Unconditional design. Sequence first.
Lengths: 114, 143, 104, 87
Amino acid sequence: SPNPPKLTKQMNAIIDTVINYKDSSGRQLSEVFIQLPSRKELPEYYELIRKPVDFKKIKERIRNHKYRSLGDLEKDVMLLCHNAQTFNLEGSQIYEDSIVLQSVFKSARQKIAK
Amino acid sequence: PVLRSVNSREPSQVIFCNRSPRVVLPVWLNFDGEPQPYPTLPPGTGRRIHSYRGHLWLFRDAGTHDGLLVNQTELFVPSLNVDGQPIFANITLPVYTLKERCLQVVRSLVKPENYRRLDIVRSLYEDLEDHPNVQKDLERLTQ
Amino acid sequence: MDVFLMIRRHKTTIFTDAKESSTVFELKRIVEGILKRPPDEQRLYKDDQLLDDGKTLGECGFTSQTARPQAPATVGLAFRADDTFEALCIEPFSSPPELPDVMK
Amino acid sequence: MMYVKLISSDGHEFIVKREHALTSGTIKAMLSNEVNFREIPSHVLSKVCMYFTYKVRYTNSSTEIPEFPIAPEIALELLMAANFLDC
């Protein structure tokens, strides 16, 4: 299970860039995706989607050493963005926020690589 | 944009009350200033909704998109609850001008393609085609 | 509770407002102030029933739920020409044109 | 309370309050006692007078505002009157 510290160095640096994007106006776009909605608040979300995720769980995956490469971590971030775009309708705030966090992560994966 | 919600992150309980014969459609102005629809309110119904402080709201008709006043004003924003007391939003009909009210009745009876086949003056066809719009009123609301 | 009504006679139609508690005599005093004819020279009606001076508008059947601003209740009015009172006559309004085929 | 006489095309005389008739911008310009309309019929002008009593009553009324009913048979003629009257 223990993974190389230099890979873990980057795996947290990609997510921290995604977590801390203020978008000039001073609004953290990635603050709603930190913790999943409570299952007792509205079950319709858990009924509509097949696999739930959130950045608290993605941060814990580095601590548990689940992700073995950048491709495994990218699989879950695109799946999280897909869950947002599936439940939320086109034109809403969360739909456009996940579209911004999708691009911010693609540029962050490249910057970290080279 | 000047008209947008403020990301306060402090809960604010609100009571949306529909005191009009129309199917009210609550519309929320998001953090980028764009409007967003929410579940409609049938005539003469009230529900206790969970909102946040400094969040801008405006209410229109579900079908015709005609403007509706709240607490005798165009738009509303709930502030923090004093001692956990709900904020009330009494949605009412504005006292429409007889011209604007007459347009709405003809708009519901006649189809958009058959506006210019009516026996009326040239200036009234352009006024009938000028439907109620959210973005139009948001540009007008700024000052 | 306010009562919005239209006191009608031949072609003259007075639009005014009164209270449910106010008397029929007080409504004749309002017509006295507009058309300049004393109360003893007037006869008010609800449909085809002669209203007494002492009775209130609420007692005559003019409730505020029916008599509203957007749809005022029609009240008949007949004047006296010296000796006897004239017969109640109200000229109806002009009929609208037939609904166009496009509007159906 | 001051009153004003509004005459229709077919000769129907409608007595309304001065304040009520000022709702219309066109009538406000004509007055500033008796006003005659050659293009507006009685069934339309009575509906315009019903709107004047409706507006003045429910303006600044925070209670609740009922909707002004317009039947499909007079919606076209009452629209042309409202545009000419500016109300």
